[PDB]
Symmetry: C2
Subunit: 608 residues, 2 copies
């Protein structure tokens, strides 16, 4: 009996308005690396079948949000380096398929580089040296060895935050750090030492967002920023050569990033939702692609050349846009979440995060209608879905059908087109999911922290004494109390499909199984989790008797308990970093989970 | 043993830069009607199976391009009226027998109303009267009975082309005709007669492109045009009430169409690639939707309200855009061809048309990289396709990889990454499909009109003597003639998948089967078609012995011949109006066809 990972739908790259998201690409594995929340991801761009893991997730930064992730330049080393807001940089490696037939991530080294957040990281061409930058205390960056962390020079010439850096990928070695107040600094080394600064070519007060030496001999170094200027310097002497400008193509928005496709051409991306490919020698824009400027999410905040004329651009809305020099049309777009997933539905698969974003995976439709945490999703009506959010609205297919007088804390929908909601004013509301009309309501005796709606009942977890009250869906004046209460505030409740049982967990990790009809406890032997229970879902028959119940908690784990054998547990550890939020049976033999890491995972459940 | 229709992928609405495309929608059947080429289509919007046929195709306008198709208002009547460039209006009805999956189209009446082209048509609310408008020598429109064609009034007040009309959908009946030079005319009736003219509210020389009375009581009438003005008139008196303008929402482009959602709100769409919903009373833009203005193809040419807040906008690029009031994001998009299909690939399914448009059905990616007819498509390389066009280029995934010194007339690729091209200068070129490099060539002793490339041979139809010359791929210096020449110019050639036989048809309708090795005719029994042959494709095994051969002809038919029994034929008549252009077996039992009518059809072969 087991639960094995079947598929991982990674999140999109994290993004911030007015900030660049530095991406990374590896030719050998044809993968891109990027941060999202407290994790660093490596996504393979391949299709069909390959030897490369579809996804590699690194959670070693713990409680610190990851800022950047960079592949080592050494082919096949399978090493990477990432930094976080706490100012810590980590060198780690992965391995896939062996005795385990799974991915293994190992920290090779870690150093506390800066006080404040790290903004960018760069490897030397040997993959043994690192230029780490950001904004610490009286120190905005360093040059260190990848293994011991010893200093290999100094970052200087900056009185403000450094936004990007890059090391010439060849001898003689040179470096460039770029930052706020239009500051740019050239270095020679190792040991990397200040060579010259420049604050005349980029407007003062401007944000110089990115820098990169041309490939091969690195004869050129280019810097770009919010002042929409493209500065070209000599890759060895650091002298200013000229601005890259084409009178037939004015840059209309602040630039966020660049990336060379080869030794003569490079792409720039900015707030004007335009991707441009420039030729350094002629200074002409040989290619460009645009998106509707009227949509804030279309701003391009990151970009990376992926070999042979291919380019991947990152939109502010987290979407990855695929282009190819010589083809005037975008090849494809990949969208998704980059914020914790708080709501899930199955058949069809629909997800919602804490920023209000909803994903319709059947049609790859991404929505940004809601503006806050998605409380619940209902897909009981053919081709439609109803969502509730902390923005105080209920929307049907992205259209507001009800405005909440009180913020909905939690909610649960059955299969008949109804949804039970618990508000901040302690009211239990029953709404017609696809019309938005409140059909009936009752004021709870105390605040409610969890609700489960079955065909005929409404189970509510009361914060007063952590008790569970069960109402008749047909008459909210009629209810009964489960004899035994939980030991802490109810966190999640789930009435069995036949309504024979009611599983209920609390914020401590305790889960109790009740016999709905006798309102008595049937078993209290289900292992304590020492962590908040976030999801409970009953397994459907392919024997028809209810038994196995999947559960996820803040302890990142997935425990499938058994009514019949309370001591029998099939589990999958480390399902989601910072906790499994939703869990459902897409199939009698397959589970789908989602977590605070903004990932959605499918699992095969084998009873053997 | 038979061929039955399995699926129909209808074209997109026909479109023209600077012109509006008047769409029609029927609530009762949840379908939309629109023109494309010389056909009128009705596409059901239903996602889940219903009693309504997915597609209805009227081909009665014959050789004349269809310009507008309108549903009758009578719920369930199943009648429609369409007009064409020859100035002919036709009232027709369809019947659908789900079980047989058969659609019957009957012509109720046809009237030659204008000398010139028809631009718009409107039914009265009783579905018994018609306002037909356009650009004629003597008249620009008429008012007639749907059954007798007898006049029910007179169109007047216009000295220039009329672009559209509408009949107030209630008594007292009224009408509005709109046209060039910013002229607007209001009528009363029946008998519909001139009531008042207005060449003051729309700029002189501008094109008033659309007009529509509000639903129900029709208290209002609105006109829109290239001058960017939205003029609101009283539905009963015709008196100008006010310009519909929102200080917070300026119209930055010529308007092409409008459609009332209800009695208070309507939508306008135009050259500024923006769909706007207004409220006549407040005069405010209640909702807006935009597409990237930097792309010509996003200009909006048509629009129609489909009820309950739903709206469909038509892009200049033929794409249908689905929106819904109160939802700031596009629901979905439907793209495709609106020009005859000329190239076809299978597994995955890719199609190309004579405007150079290429569609990747597997991912629903519509391409406009080429600027002219697609001569051929090759999808032999994994996740990639090579296309050759009359724009003189060979592209790989939409990127030019070769520029021809002489225009490619026809081309044929095999499964090994090669393509044989016959140029306008009579050269046979062998190119690597995915690099664009020419690796070998030879000047033919005559112009070539057809090619077939197999693993080892190149079959070429020569226009001089109508002979077939078969070169050895590995050495263009080695070639042999098939003993018997064709009766006429070769039009399509296909070498057997084992290279045992060679099927060849000419522009007259004759197809001959040759034995490649002995270069002798194996059978000349296959029925003559009195119509040029455009396609030949051998059926693959699920005995292995080659036998069935699918063939498409200009006369619209599909004939599957037999090598074993030359007299037996499995046919599918009327597969594509104006001719089946391409045929391929995406499966041993499923034949895929493309036609001059821009449709793609899948057939099951019993
Ligand atoms: Zn939406
Ligand atoms: Zn394209």
């Amino acid at each position: 009996s087991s639960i094995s990972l079947k598929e991982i739908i990674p999140p999109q790259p994290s993004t911030q308005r007015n900030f660049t998201t530095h991406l990374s690409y590896d030719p050998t594995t044809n993968a891109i690396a990027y941060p999202c929340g407290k994790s660093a991801f490596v996504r393979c761009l391949d299709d069909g079948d390959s030897k490369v893991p579809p996804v590699v997730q690194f959670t070693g930064h713990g409680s610190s949000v990851v800022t950047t992730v960079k592949f080592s330049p050494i082919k096949g080393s399978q090493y990477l380096c990432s930094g976080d807001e706490s100012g810590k940089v980590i060198v780690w490696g992965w391995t896939f398929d062996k005795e385990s037939n799974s991915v293994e991530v190992n920290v090779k080294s870690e150093f506390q580089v800066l006080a404040g957040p790290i903004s960018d990281i760069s490897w030397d061409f040997e993959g043994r040296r690192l230029c780490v930058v950001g904004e610490g205390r009286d120190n905005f960056g360093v040059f260190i060895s990848w293994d011991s962390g010893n200093s290999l020079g100094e970052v200087s010439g900056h009185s403000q935050r450094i936004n990007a850096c890059h090391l010439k990928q060849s001898r003689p070695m040179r470096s460039m750090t770029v930052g706020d107040d239009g500051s740019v600094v050239f270095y020679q080394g190792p040991p990397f030492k200040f060579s010259a600064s420049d604050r005349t070519h980029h407007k003062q007060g401007s944000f110089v967002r990115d820098v990169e030496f041309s490939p091969d001999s690195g004869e050129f170094v280019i810097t770009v920023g919010s002042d929409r200027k493209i500065s070209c310097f000599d890759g060895k002497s650091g002298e200013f050569l000229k601005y890259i400008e084409d009178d037939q193509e004015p840059v209309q928005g602040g630039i966020f990033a660049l990336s060379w496709l080869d030794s003569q051409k490079f792409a720039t991306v900015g707030a004007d939702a335009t991707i441009r490919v420039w030729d350094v020698t002629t200074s002409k824009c040989v290619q460009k692609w645009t998106l509707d400027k009227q949509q804030l999410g279309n701003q391009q905040v990151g970009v990376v050349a992926t070999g042979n004329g291919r380019i991947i651009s990152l939109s502010l809305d987290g979407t990855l846009n695929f282009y190819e020099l010589g083809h005037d049309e975008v090849l494809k777009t990949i969208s998704g979440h980059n914020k914790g997933i708080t709501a899930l539905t199955v058949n069809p698969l629909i997800s919602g995060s804490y920023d209000g974003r909803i994903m319709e995976w059947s049609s790859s439709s991404m929505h940004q209608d809601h503006s806050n945490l998605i409380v619940s999703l209902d897909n009981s009506k053919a081709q439609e879905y109803s969502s509730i959010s902390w923005d105080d609205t209920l929307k049907v297919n992205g259209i507001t059908k009800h405005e909440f007088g009180s913020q909905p804390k939690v909610a649960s929908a059955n299969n008949d087109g109804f949804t039970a909601v618990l508000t901040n004013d302690d009211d239990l509301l029953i709404l017609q999911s696809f019309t938005g009309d409140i059909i009936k309501s009752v004021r709870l005796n105390s605040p409610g922290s969890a609700v489960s709606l079955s065909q005929n009942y409404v189970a509510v977890g009361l914060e007063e004494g952590n008790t569970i009250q069960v109402f008749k869906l047909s008459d909210l004046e009629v209810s009964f109390d489960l004899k035994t209460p939980l030991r802490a505030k109810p966190s999640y409740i789930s009435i069995s499909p036949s309504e024979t049982y009611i599983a209920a967990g609390d914020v401590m990790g305790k889960i109790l199984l009740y016999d709905l009809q006798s309102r008595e406890v049937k078993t209290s032997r289900w292992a304590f989790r020492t962590s908040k229970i976030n999801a409970i879902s009953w397994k459907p028959a392919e024997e028809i008797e209810e038994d196995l119940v999947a559960t996820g908690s803040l302890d990142t784990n997935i425990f499938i308990y058994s009514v019949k054998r309370p001591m029998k547990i099939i589990k999958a550890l480390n399902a989601h970093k910072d906790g499994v939020n939703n869990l459902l049976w897409e199939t009698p033999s397959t589970l789908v989970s989602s977590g605070a890491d903004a990932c959605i995972k499918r699992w095969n459940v084998v009873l053997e």
